[PDB]
Amino acid sequence: SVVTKAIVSADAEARYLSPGELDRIRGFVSSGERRLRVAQTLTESRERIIKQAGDQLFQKRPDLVSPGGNAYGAERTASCLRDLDYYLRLVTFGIVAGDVTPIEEIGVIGVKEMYRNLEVPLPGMVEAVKAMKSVATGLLSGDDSAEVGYYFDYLAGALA
Amino acid sequence: SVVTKAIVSADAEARYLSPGELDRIRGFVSSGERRLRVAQTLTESRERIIKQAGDQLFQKRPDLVSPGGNAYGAERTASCLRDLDYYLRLVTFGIVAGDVTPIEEIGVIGVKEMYRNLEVPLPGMVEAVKAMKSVATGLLSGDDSAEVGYYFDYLAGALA
Amino acid sequence: SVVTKAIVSADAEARYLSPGELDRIRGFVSSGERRLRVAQTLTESRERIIKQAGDQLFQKRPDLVSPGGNAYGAERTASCLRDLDYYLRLVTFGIVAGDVTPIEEIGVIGVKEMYRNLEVPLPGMVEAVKAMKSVATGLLSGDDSAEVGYYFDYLAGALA
Amino acid sequence: KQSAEVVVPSFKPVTSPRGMDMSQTPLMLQAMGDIAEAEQEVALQKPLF
Amino acid sequence: MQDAITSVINTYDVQGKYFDTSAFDKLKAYYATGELRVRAAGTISANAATIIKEASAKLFSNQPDLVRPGGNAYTTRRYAACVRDMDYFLRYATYAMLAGDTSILDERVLNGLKETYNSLGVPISSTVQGIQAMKEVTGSLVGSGAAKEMGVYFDYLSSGLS
Amino acid sequence: MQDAITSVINTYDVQGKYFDTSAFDKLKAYYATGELRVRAAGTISANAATIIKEASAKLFSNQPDLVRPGGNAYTTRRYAACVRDMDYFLRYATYAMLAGDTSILDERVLNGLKETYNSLGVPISSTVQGIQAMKEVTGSLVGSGAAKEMGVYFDYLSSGLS
Amino acid sequence: MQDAITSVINTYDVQGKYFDTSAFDKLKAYYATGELRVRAAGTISANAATIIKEASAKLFSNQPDLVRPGGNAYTTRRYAACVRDMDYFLRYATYAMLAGDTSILDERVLNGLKETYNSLGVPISSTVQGIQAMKEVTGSLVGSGAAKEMGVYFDYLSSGLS
Amino acid sequence: MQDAITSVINTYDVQGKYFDTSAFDKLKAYYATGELRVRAAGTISANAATIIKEASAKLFSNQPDLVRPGGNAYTTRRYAACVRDMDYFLRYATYAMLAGDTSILDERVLNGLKETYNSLGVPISSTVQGIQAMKEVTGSLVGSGAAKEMGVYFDYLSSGLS
Numbered sequence A, B, C: 001s002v003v004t005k006a007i008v009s010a011d012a013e014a015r016y017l018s019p020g021e022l023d024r025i026r027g028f029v030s031s032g033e034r035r036l037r038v039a040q041t042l043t044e045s046r047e048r049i050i051k052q053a054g055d056q057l058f059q060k061r062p063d064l065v066s067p068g069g070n071a072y073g074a075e076r077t078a079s080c081l082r083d084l085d086y087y088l089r090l091v092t093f094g095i096v097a098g099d100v101t102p103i104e105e106i107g108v109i110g111v112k113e114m115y116r117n118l119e120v121p122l123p124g125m126v127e128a129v130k131a132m133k134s135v136a137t138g139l140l141s142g143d144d145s146a147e148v149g150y151y152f153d154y155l156a157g158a159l160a
Numbered sequence D: 001k002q003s004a005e006v007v008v009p010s011f012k013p014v015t016s017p018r019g020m021d022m023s024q025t026p027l028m029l030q031a032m033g034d035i036a037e038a039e040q041e042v043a044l045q046k047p048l049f
Numbered sequence E, F, G, H: 001m002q003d004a005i006t007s008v009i010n011t012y013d014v015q016g017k018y019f020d021t022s023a024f025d026k027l028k029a030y031y032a033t034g035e036l037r038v039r040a041a042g043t044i045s046a047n048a049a050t051i052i053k054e055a056s057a058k059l060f061s062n063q064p065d066l067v068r069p070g071g072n073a074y075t076t077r078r079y080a081a082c083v084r085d086m087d088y089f090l091r092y093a094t095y096a097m098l099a100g101d102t103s104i105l106d107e108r109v110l111n112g113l114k115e116t117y118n119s120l121g122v123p124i125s126s127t128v129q130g131i132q133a134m135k136e137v138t139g140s141l142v143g144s145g146a147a148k149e150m151g152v153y154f155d156y157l158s159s160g161l162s
C-alpha cells in the first residue's frame, strides 16, 4: 500500500520518512473513507458486474465461447468468469490499499506464463478487464469512476 | 378435545397457556380441516361399512348368529348392527375431536359391565371392531387409513 | 423442549405418545431449521440488541439510572445490561427449544425472590424486556418476529 | 422414633453424566452425514463461477 | 368442561345422529377462528397483569367507596381478594374464548359464585362493573374481532354474576 | 428430564455462552433424526402389546422356573407385575429414544430399581434377559437403524440394572 | 426443643433432685442475659431482610463464581434456594440465641443437612462462608454485647456443616 | 513488510473473500489513527538524536560497566556502534508504528539478531535496557495516545531480543 511503499523507500535509504512522504501518507489516510465506500459499492455489486462483464466479453468476442475457444463450454466459461471475479476482488484490494500493489503482486507477476500454460489469450484478458471497467465505472460517480478506472487501466496494461 | 385437554392442563397450575401450548393448538386447528374431510368420508359411507363389517363378522364368527348364540334372531342381529352403528358414530366423533376422549366417554367406560349384563361376548366385539376397521381403512386412502385405524385399534383394545 | 413436554405429559398419563403428539414433534422438527436461523440472527446482533434495549429502557425510565435508583452508576448499569444479555441468551435457548421451558428453569423460577433480595424493581425489568422485544423483533421478518415476540411476552408476563 | 435420619435427603441430579456423549451413535453419525449433503447442495445452488 | 367441537359432538350424540352438513360447517367455522383466538389468548397472557391493573383502577375510580373504610374492598386482604377475583375472571374468560364455548364458565366460575358472593355480602353490581372494565381494557389490547369475541364471554360472566 | 435439545442448552448455559457453530450442528443432527425417531416411536407404540407378548414368552421359555410354583413370576398377581414392569421398560425406552438422551432412564427407571428388586427377591439377571428379549423383538419391527438406536437405550437399562 | 431453663430442669429431674444453689445460679445467669437476648432478637427481626441482603452480597462478592454460569448459585431458582437457606440459618440461629441453647439447631437444621447438600452438589465450604458473612453482619447490627453470644450459634452451625 | 491494510488484505485473500463489515471496521480503525501516526513519526524523526542521547545516558548511567575498560561499549568504535544500534531500533520502531504492524521488525531487525549479538559478545539484557530507556524517553515527547502505540513496537523489539 501507500504506507508500505513510503516505508520501503525510506528503508532502502536508511532514513526516516521525509516530510513529503508523511504528507502523502496524511493525504492517503484523509481520503480513506471515500475509497472505502468505493470498495463497499463495488463489493455489494459483485454478481451484477461479473455477469454483465461476461456478457459484453462474449458478445464482443464470440470466438472465446465458440467450439474450439478457450472458454468453450459451461465449466470453462465459469472459470473465465471467476478469473474476472478474482480481478474485481484484487481491484477492491487495490482501492483500499491506495496503490496497485495487491493487483501487481497477486495477479500480474507471472500472469503471462500462467495464461500461456492455460492457452488463455492475453488479448481476451484485455477486453475482459475493459468490459469489467465499463460495468464497474457505470455504477460509480464520476470521481469514483475515474479513480477505479485508473486501476482497471493498470490491469489492462499489465495483461497487455 | 386437544384444546380442552390443554385448557384443563393449564387450569391445573392456574396459568395461561404457554407459547408452545398455543402452538400445539395452532397445529390442531391447522389439521382440523383434513380431519373434517376424513370424518365426512367415513360418515357418507356408513351404511356400506356397517353391512360389510356385520357380514364379515358373522362369517368369521358363525356361532354368534347360530342357534344358542347371543346374536341369533332378527331383532338381536339388528341390535348387533345398531351397536356397530354406535361405534362408527363414536369413531367419527373421535376423528373430528382429534383424540379418543369422546370415544371413551360415550362408549368405553363401563362397557365391560354393560356387555356382561347383556351376555355379549367381548371377543365378538373385538372381532366386530377389527372387521369394521378393515372395511373403513379399505374405503379410505393411504394417509387417512393410519389415523382412522388408530381409533379403531384403541376401541378394540378397550374391549379387549 | 417440545419433545420433553410431550414425553412428560404422556408419562403423567402412563401411556405412549398419541399420534397427535407425534405429529406435533414432526412439526417442531420440521420447523427446527427456521428456529435455528432465528436464533443465529438474534445471537449475531447480541450487542446491538442489548445496547439499543438499554437505551430505550433508560430513556423510558430515567429514574432507574437517576440518583436513588437501583441502576444508578456505571457498574450497576453494567450489571443491568448483563441481566439483559442473560435474558437474550435465554430467549435464543427458548427459540431453539420450541417452548419457554429453558427460559423458565433458568430465569423465571425464583426470579421474584432473587430480585427482591437485589432490591431490583420488577416493573423496570418488564420495560427492559419490552425494549428488548422491540429491538429484537425489529431485526427479524414479521413471521419470525411473531414467534420471538411470543417468547418475549412470556418473559414479560413472568416477570410481571 | 426408630430413627431421626432423613430417608430421602434429596434426589441426585441427572443433569450431567460423565462420558457417553452419544455423538458417536450411528443414528447421529448418519445425521452428520446427511447435513453434509445438505450443505453441499446449498453450495451447488450458488453460481458456478 | 367442553369446547366448541365437544359441544357439537354432544349435541349430535344426545340425538344419536351422524355429523350432517351443518355440524361440519360449525366445525369449519370454529377452525377458521382458531388463529385469531390463539393470538388473542397470547396477547391477554402477556398483558393480563396490566389489564387487571388498569381495570381495577377504573373500577375503584368510578366507585371510590369500594376501597375506602367501610367498603367491601377496604383492606389489603379484601383488596387482594378483589384483584384475585378479577384475575381469575380474566383468565377463565380467556379459557372460554380459546375453547369457543361458555361451559368452562358455568363449571368452574359460575358454579357457586353467585351464592358465595351473596353469603360474603359482596356487592354484585360492582363486580359486574369490574367485569365490564376488564372488557374495555381487553378490547383495547386485542383489537376489533378479538374484542367482540371476548365481550361475548365477559357479558356471559356479567349475566351469571347478576 | 432432559433431551438432546435441552442437553445442548444446558451445556451452553453452564458455560454462559450463546450458541456456536458446534451447537447448531448438534441441533441440526437431532432435527435430522427427529423423523426417524418419530417413526420408531409410532411403530413401537402400535405394537407394544405384541412386543411384551413375545418378550415374556421368550423369557419364560428360557427360564421356566420363574413361572413354576414358587417362582417370582408365579401368581396371577406377580405375573401381571412382571409384564407390567416389561411394559414400563418398553415405554421408557421409547421415551428415551424419542428424546435422544438417557437422562429419563436414570431419573425415572434406574433410580432405586436395583434395591427395589433386591428388597423383593426379583431376579435382576432374569429381568436383564427379559430386557434383551424386548430388544430382539423390537429390533425386528423398527428396522435396522431404529434397531441400533433402540438397542442403545435397552443396553443402558440392562447395564444400569446389572 | 430445649432451652437453658428446661436444660437445668431436665438435669435435675433425671437426678430426682430439687433445685440447689448451682441450679439457681444458672437460672439467674439466664434471667440476667434474657433482656440482652430479647433486644438482639428484636433487632434481628427488624433487620432480617437487610441481614440476608448484605450477607449474600458479601458472599457473592468474595466468591463471584457462585452466581456466574457454572456456579451452584447460578440461576434464579438456585439463587432463591441459596437465599432461602440463609434465611433458615438466620432465623434458627436467632431462635437458638433467644433460647440460650443449640438443641434446636441440631434438631431442625443440622440433621441431614450435609447429606442434602452432598446429594445436591451444594458446596459446603461456600455455605459455611455465607454463614460467616451472616455472622459478621448480624454481629455488627446487634452490638458488641450480643455479638459474642450470637456468634456462638453461628459458629455452632458452621462447625456442624464443616 | 506488511502494514495493517495489507494484513487485512492477506486475511481476506487467503480465504478468497471480498471485504466484509469487519474488514471495513478494521480499515476504518487504521484510517482513523493515521494522522496520529504521522504526527508521532514526524516528532520522533525531529528528535531522534535527542532521544538517543537520553536513552544512551540512562543506559550507561544504570550500567557504567558497559563503558568501563573491558565492557562491550568500551571504545570510541564500540560506543559509536552501540548508539548506532540504538538508532536502528528507534528508526525501525518508527517504521513499524507508521505501518501499524510489526512485520518489518521481524524481517529486518530481529531475524538472526540474537545469534549475531551472541557471536559479537553484545549483551542482550543491556540492549533490552537501552530499548526500554528509549521507550520512556520517546513516550514523553510523542504524547500519551502516541506513547501507548509506540510502546507496543518497543516492547515487541524487547521481547524479540529476550
Ligand SMILES: CCC1=C(C)/C(=C/C2=NC(=C\c3[nH]c(/C=C4\NC(=O)[C@H](C)[C@H]4CC)c(C)c3CCC(=O)O)/C(CCC(=O)O)=C2C)NC1=O
Binding pocket: B064, B070, B071, B076, B077, B079, B080, B081, B083, B084, B086, B106, B107, B114, B118, B120, B121, B123, B124, B125, B128
Ligand atoms: C353408545 C354406547 C352404547 C352401546 C355400545 C350400547 C350397547 C347395547 N346393546 C344392547 C343390546 C344388544 N347388543 C347386541 C350386540 C352383540 N351381539 C353380538 O354378539 C356382537 C358381538 C355384539 C355386537 C357387535 C345384542 C345381541 C343385543 C341384544 C341383547 C338382548 O336383547 O338380549 C343394549 C341393550 C338396550 C337395547 O337393546 O336397546 C345396549 C345398551 N348402548 C349404548 O348406549
Ligand SMILES: CCC1=C(C)/C(=C/C2=NC(=C\c3[nH]c(/C=C4\NC(=O)[C@H](C)[C@H]4CC)c(C)c3CCC(=O)O)/C(CCC(=O)O)=C2C)NC1=O
Binding pocket: C064, C070, C071, C076, C077, C079, C080, C081, C083, C084, C086, C087, C106, C107, C118, C120, C121, C122, C123, C124, C125, C128, G060, G067, G068, G073, G074, G075, G076, G079
Ligand atoms: C440466568 C438467570 C440470572 C439472572 C437474571 C441473574 C440476575 C442478577 N443480577 C444481579 C445484580 C444486578 N442486576 C441489576 C439489573 C436491574 N437493575 C435495573 O433496575 C433493571 C430494572 C434491572 C435490569 C434490567 C443491577 C443494577 C444489579 C446490581 C445490584 C447490586 O450491585 O447490588 C445479580 C447479583 C450477582 C451479580 O451481580 O453477579 C444477579 C444474580 N442471575 C442469574 O443467575
Ligand SMILES: CCC1=C(C)/C(=C/C2=NC(=C\c3[nH]c(/C=C4\NC(=O)[C@H](C)[C@H]4CC)c(C)c3CCC(=O)O)/C(CCC(=O)O)=C2C)NC1=O
Binding pocket: E060, E067, E073, E074, E075, E076, E079
Ligand atoms: C388499611 C389498609 C389499606 C391500605 C394500606 C390501602 C392503600 C391504597 N393506596 C391506594 C392508592 C395509592 N397509594 C399510593 C402510595 C405510594 N406512593 C409512594 O409510592 C409510597 C411508596 C407509597 C405510600 C407510602 C399512591 C401513589 C397511590 C395512587 C396510585 C395511582 O393512582 O396510580 C389505593 C387505591 C385507592 C386510592 O386511590 O385511595 C389503596 C387501596 N388501602 C387499604 O384498605
Ligand SMILES: CCC1=C(C)/C(=C/C2=NC(=C\c3[nH]c(/C=C4\NC(=O)[C@H](C)[C@H]4CC)c(C)c3CCC(=O)O)/C(CCC(=O)O)=C2C)NC1=O
Binding pocket: E066, E072, E073, E078, E079, E081, E082, E083, E084, E085, E086, E088, E089, E108, E109, E113, E116, E120, E122, E123, E126, E127, E130
Ligand atoms: C375460580 C372462580 C372463583 C372465584 C372468582 C371465586 C371468588 C371468591 N371471592 C371470595 C371473597 C371476596 N371477593 C371479593 C371481591 C369483591 N369485592 C369488591 O368489592 C369487588 C366488587 C368484588 C370483586 C371485583 C372480596 C372483597 C372478598 C373478601 C370478602 C370478605 O372476606 O369479607 C371468596 C371467599 C374465599 C377467599 O376469600 O379466599 C371466593 C371463593 N371463587 C371461585 O371458585
Ligand SMILES: CCC1=C(C)/C(=C/C2=NC(=C\c3[nH]c(/C=C4\NC(=O)[C@H](C)[C@H]4CC)c(C)c3CCC(=O)O)/C(CCC(=O)O)=C2C)NC1=O
Binding pocket: F060, F067, F068, F073, F074, F075, F076, F079
Ligand atoms: C396358580 C395361578 C397361575 C395360573 C392360573 C397361571 C396360568 C399360566 N398359563 C400359562 C400358559 C398356558 N395356559 C394355557 C390355558 C388356556 N388354553 C385354552 O385356551 C384354555 C381357555 C385355557 C385353559 C383352560 C395355555 C394353552 C398355555 C400355553 C400358552 C403358550 O405356550 O403359548 C402360563 C405361562 C407359563 C407356562 O406356560 O408355564 C401361565 C403363567 N399361572 C399361574 O401362576
Ligand SMILES: CCC1=C(C)/C(=C/C2=NC(=C\c3[nH]c(/C=C4\NC(=O)[C@H](C)[C@H]4CC)c(C)c3CCC(=O)O)/C(CCC(=O)O)=C2C)NC1=O
Binding pocket: H060, H067, H073, H074, H075, H076, H079
Ligand atoms: C578509550 C576510549 C574512550 C574514551 C576517550 C571515552 C571517553 C568518555 N567520556 C565520557 C564522559 C565525559 N567526558 C568528559 C570530558 C570532556 N569534558 C570537557 O568538555 C572536556 C573538553 C572534555 C575533557 C578534556 C566529561 C566532562 C564527561 C562527563 C559527562 C557527563 O557525565 O555528563 C564517557 C561516558 C561514560 C562515562 O561517564 O565514563 C565516555 C565513554 N570512552 C572510551 O571508551
